[PDB]
Design a protein around this ligand. Structure first.
Ligand code: NA
Ligand code: NA
Ligand code: NA
Ligand code: NA
Lengths: 494, 494, 494, 494
């Protein structure tokens, strides 16, 4: 049930968004954003830098001042605004989905039915949280009345990646706005278009000027300025584990701003011998290949018990070979192109790395088309723990299938990683499910499923996959600053 | 390692407890409490009535007055007092265990390792809640500061049964005292001794006079007076569904006091064909025969899938036949006598009904000794849903085994009851486990286990098995009165 | 900025609402609903009795069956439906506000700006709660995984009054529908029209058939049938303290259904000598006269500190003498007619009683118009605690002003009541405010304000003013049935 | 009632605590700890370095392994252990209070009645949290069962200061141990003795080996070793804002461990003209001079409304001049010496600067004794915001009194700081209290009181005074790692 797409949507926003208005970079510089399916330039976008970040931060700080419209506004009204933003996004759903695909490369059907659906659900969920994150009245010792106020953390710098442009924007804005914070957001240079159009909707929804400011540009410039800014109270970064370290260092070198990170992974998908074969094979395929393999929690280590290995691999290879690669605007297309040339080459390198390491190439392993950044669904068999393709995040359509014998063994191998974002277990046994879900050191453990995200369930990593949680009630903690008020009273009574 | 018992523990307390003092009934009347193992009178106990209840309520009301030691006391200190009471109970553990057995009939080993261990864990668990049940600061619309105060509900009338004398006392005192309430407790005429001794430990612990008042006596007199009292704010009753109805009506007919009930049940224990036979058989036995079958959540309807029915029944009969009945102070004894003559005769009557209606008597069926209220471990097979023994709570060592074919069938049959206190599922399959735990209309659903109680987890019934929950955080709800305080402020800000 | 009202709005709904269909009463009997401003009959309404309630309960039970559209529906979608309902009600705001005024008598401007605004805020508030009322994962002892499911209580009987027809309906449906329950609502015979039209919007919004069934009729018939029904799981009642007892007795006499009550009061509004005179006088006026004085938490006992007594009374009389009484559809009207003849006469009786017992009549005291049920704003000075008008709920435009000297004194006099729905304190002093808000035995204590309701803050009474709380997160407690699921695991670890 | 102290308590522990055993530093080096009251060496303490920290981390990691005694231990038992530890500390209360005074310098009476009392209260409070920090069951979309496990964060590195040796240790251990984490603690080189003795009690209490590890030593060595360790999962640092930045940079440069900081401040104590003069004078004195002015939240900026300035200052000066400085073991002593020579000199430097910049020296201003690190109670009047002594944390007995006129003025001047740990407001006015408590940007706002700490109320700073909160329920957040488990089920129902 998908409406026909406009395969060449018009672009209306390509500037810096500050105080509900559009601005060119101070430098007047602009950068081209490319269509990964064709390798052609879509349009040019204002290149924000430190001076532009400074302007955004000031606007946000001004909007956060005591007595301002955003500060005085009823919590419930913040809820009304988020719900209005969601309605506007829904009104322009067909357009946003098409634009999302044009700039990112993912199939339009997926942008429409998945990405935008989750954006709506995310904003609508958080709109409901606006006036329900209560503080506490505390039974402190002595003749006192003690309580806590859950106040907004303040100016929040949010940096989002390119794999899920609109969704990542929603995951950030939802909890921050619901709790009354102000935002300075840095969108990915590879996919700035959809986020900038949403800014138009933010103004249309009635949000006071300066509550949400978006600055497109690059990381070493715009992103770094936000992380090192002396007046940004909190920063939330989603991207690579490498840059996450840069962000936290910047925060510690500046004003000690609160930090939360959502980084990458090398998530283990464990297939026990008693699992439903047909379901496990389809879910394992989805777990890895979804969104051109460009998912932080991709099931990149498919552990399969030795007794069902041969069959599982045979079916996985057949599924990989049938996966249609092509024009994301074509309904038959399952896999579009990678996001850009840099990623395209990085994946080709990892594919060659696997071949050099001795991993058995079962299918694919090369370029899928001459134009664009298309890579053939690739499957590696007999992968070993010590192999690079088994340790490092590839972020592409490259599957690793490993073999194991016992349940105690797989736990140790699954946990033997610096990453710990997600994990999965496929089994029909009650005990094995509980044994594994408890033992796996990962932020999310899916049982008989994969990539099941709910705005109400927290998401985040263990170890170096990140810190802090997004989504759910937990997603509000990082956007709250706690204040204790302890008042002397004549005589405290229970 | 169970310390040797004093098979004839001396009785030190047998009067009405009010304001930390011992009083005879105003009428000066006394009733005998019998040792169910011999049928001989242990001692005489003060027979409280309306006038005695009136004295206790006034004492409790006085102790609840604003500015009183109990009202002004720091919440954290209430916890210290609760832990102190627990330490005193642990000091007198062997004595209380022996006294529990003497008056109740349950095996001394069980009173020691089970009942008293749970009493200590319950009291210590609630001690920790004392200063942690926070109220809220609410982000209401307009220029206001709104918050809630979690105040004690007040004078709490608590009526407890005879199956777990010390434990039921703890389940009531823990939450009530942890939240700063005052208590007027009515203990069972069949088992008043142990609770009265605890009242002495409550005084030794240092609880202010009037905080806990215990009035031994009969139901139609002392209990009814509590339920109809115009100055009792909340009543908590544990007993038969029949009397539960009397309690709610009395509350409505009097001062509209808050009510919570923990009533009977006809809990189904469902054994799927893929269950572990040895474990399922042993757990099904415990599920029904525990504490002389005198448990509210007893698995009195053992549903077994047809493919394993014959074998399950065989093993169950063998286990029941090996069950050692005898002197509760004997370490070999698994089963002591029933609480009294009334119960003794009720059970024999139910066994008779089982025979008349065509249920297959597989073992037991009669008296187990010439002295004492001892009944043989009885097992009925081929029981049908329409049989009296399949519908009514027997509260004795009488096992009902029913046969079923499908999972859909057993859900309907298990839920076809006015009761809904507990239920269990024995299976190795993840889906079946989750399907059943969700579908079963019961307060507690145990998977691959039975009678697993934790002070942390709530317990209570669905339908006519009661209302409200005891234990866990939920256990505090019925003992809290919420007050909203909304203050006008110069100008509200987030 | 209120839209011009249609002073004679057409009635589209006047039958029984079951399974999203309109039905005549089984007996075919109807009853007249009158316009209290003219005394003329508006239209006939189906008179539901026990047989109709039975039909409604069966429809609700069917809609609640496991696997039904309402049970399988995502919690978030329930929120979506509640928001859709609010949107439909907002679309027909002017119509509903006029119809509310026609049937109830309250000023149109108030219906539009206050009642409907609050209805919209209540429904939208709870829409956000639909997927956020989490159960718990509990760290129980032993090798077990214990958790709780917050399930719907089931078929909920809801009986609402005539003072705030639409608002009371929202307070009930909001929390019930957000938690997934099904409803059988009984509306007041005096104001059934608006609630029936809303039922038409519930059908339009997309709620499955049977989820909400409305049965108009009388109390001793339809109301009692609900309270005594064997298949109703929970009953929520709002009305007199007298009928509240009937409801609780009916529940205990039937299936032991869960009960919550919102009854009346005689709320004390305490004015300390350091209070802002102008503010306190106006708020005290609003505190009593709001909604023709037909408010459960009306400040019917105005305590004024002796040093400012004379001036306060002086200003209060001047305010009561200038209060405009007249046609509710005229923008100048502050006070419309009382709901019906029974109330009209009852209020005149209280005024006569006040004069008989020595209260000083300062203004008003009689009929305000020859047509309709209009009463003059009446003020009584020098009222004493023992006077009838100082103890009984009048539910009319009759103000009681009492004089006091000390703060300790007023606390005792304020708390010397069987009621405890609400109270207020007017003072500039921090300690006095904290001292009084703590000491006052009332469900809601307002400081320097009155009648400040927020969908985020709980409302309910102490003592005989009721039990349980509505609004806020607390409003969800009574609509949830807790189930503990304790699963045996191989080896539990923290 | 303070027991006679042993003015020269013996030292029994002076080594590195690993796996419940006492070790010498790998290098065999030791460092002296001085008695600030005499400047003499108490004893030598093992000087821990990177190699010693590595050993501790390994021991902690081992004790944290899945299946270990600490991981398998019931949550309730962790509470039993914390309570047992508290009982042992109470048993050795007199000894510890004396040792604390010997190593730190604070008055014995204070160490006994305040520090140890709070230590006991902190451990007992958190003992109650051990089995009550529930995860959640989440109503996610689709046919899934989603829930969260609150798991321990893992190996926690904790670095505490010298101002409140025993209390700071308790603040760290309480929440960490209650949640099941393992600890590697670095104590202050100036006050390592008491913490080391408590380690003996930790072993005596029954805590498994490796659960708590204490490495005495220096910050640039041991401290940096902890913050930079690749296997430490979380770090909590309390001390100067300067070192705090080093800690967050180290964390981001290493393994992205989770961090929380409790740094310094320059907390404003606002005295409004309507404040209780006597109470405000005594509380303002306590606000600054408590613990030799060595408190992170010291009210080092005393703002006094012009109308009462002269009188307030006069009484303040008289109070400061009567403050008894001397031997901490003498019951007459109010102020002992400063912790060490470094602080002693730094404070004298600040007093010199105060005189240099124009602040009016009202009393004291120099050394109070020729032996030890005693400084006279110093009061500076007419201090201006730009002055160094009004901006920098002195951490000594130096009081700054500023004059102001309006409430808007004081808010801005109070908030014009990089710090935001605490604040106080002294006023009898309700509106003034609410206005100020909301507007002030500080972690804790005391009204009509100061330094009111409750184990149940959170404490932490805004801006650069730190991040995260300690104490109360909030203190558990930083020691918890959230894991979402999403399970596919046959058919989801509410
Ligand atoms: Na996979
Ligand atoms: Na007995
Ligand atoms: Na039984
Ligand atoms: Na009417």
């Amino acid at each position: 049930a998908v409406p026909a797409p406009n395969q060449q949507p018009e672009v209306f926003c390509n500037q810096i968004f500050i105080n509900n208005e559009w601005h060119d970079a101070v430098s007047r510089k602009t950068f081209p954003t490319v269509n990964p399916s064709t390798g052609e330039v879509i349009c040019q976008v204002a290149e924000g830098d430190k001076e532009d970040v400074d302007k955004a931060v000031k606007a946000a700080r001004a909007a956060f001042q005591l007595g301002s419209p955003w500060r005085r506004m009823d919590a419930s009204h913040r809820g009304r605004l988020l719900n209005r933003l969601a309605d506007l996004i829904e009104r322009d759903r067909t357009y946003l989905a098409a634009l999302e695909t044009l700039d990112n490369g993912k199939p339009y059907v997926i942008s429409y039915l998945v990405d935008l659906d989750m954006v709506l659900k995310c904003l609508r969920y958080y709109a409901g949280w606006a006036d329900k994150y209560h503080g506490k009245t505390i039974p402190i010792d002595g003749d006192f009345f003690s309580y806590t106020r859950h106040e907004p953390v303040g100016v929040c710098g949010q940096i989002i990646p390119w794999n899920f442009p609109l969704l990542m924007q929603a995951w950030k804005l939802g909890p921050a706005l619901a709790t009354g914070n102000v935002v300075v957001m840095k969108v990915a240079e590879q996919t700035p278009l959809t986020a900038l159009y949403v800014a138009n909707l933010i103004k249309e929804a009635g949000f006071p000027p300066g509550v949400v400011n978006i600055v497109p540009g690059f990381g070493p410039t715009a992103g770094a300025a936000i992380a090192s800014h002396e007046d940004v109270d909190k920063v939330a970064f989603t991207g690579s584990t490498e840059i996450g370290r840069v962000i936290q260092v910047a925060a510690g070198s500046s004003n000690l701003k609160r930090v939360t990170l959502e980084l990458g992974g090398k998530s283990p998908n464990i297939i026990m011998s008693d699992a439903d074969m047909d379901w496990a094979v389809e879910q394992a395929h989805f777990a890895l290949f979804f969104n051109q393999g460009q998912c932080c929690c991709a099931g990149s280590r498919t552990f399969v018990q030795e007794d069902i290995y041969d069959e599982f691999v045979e079916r996985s290879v057949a599924r990989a070979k049938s996966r249609v690669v092509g024009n994301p605007f074509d309904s038959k297309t399952e896999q579009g192109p990678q996001v850009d040339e840099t990623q395209f080459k990085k994946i080709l390198g990892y594919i060659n790395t696997g071949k050099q390491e001795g991993a058995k190439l079962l299918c694919g392993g090369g370029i899928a088309a001459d134009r664009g950044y298309f890579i053939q669904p690739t499957v590696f068999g007999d992968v070993q723990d010590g192999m690079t393709i088994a340790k490092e995040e590839i972020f592409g359509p490259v599957m690793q299938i490993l073999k194991f014998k016992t349940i105690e063994e797989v736990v140790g191998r699954a946990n033997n990683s610096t990453y710990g974002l997600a994990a999965a277990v496929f089994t029909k046994d009650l005990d094995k499910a509980n044994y594994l879900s408890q033992a796996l050191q990962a932020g999310t453990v899916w049982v008989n499923c994969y990539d099941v995200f709910g705005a109400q369930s927290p998401f985040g990593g263990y170890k170096m996959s990140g810190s802090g949680r997004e989504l759910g009630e937990y997603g509000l903690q990082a956007y709250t600053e706690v204040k204790t008020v302890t008042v002397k009273v004549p005589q405290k009574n229970s």
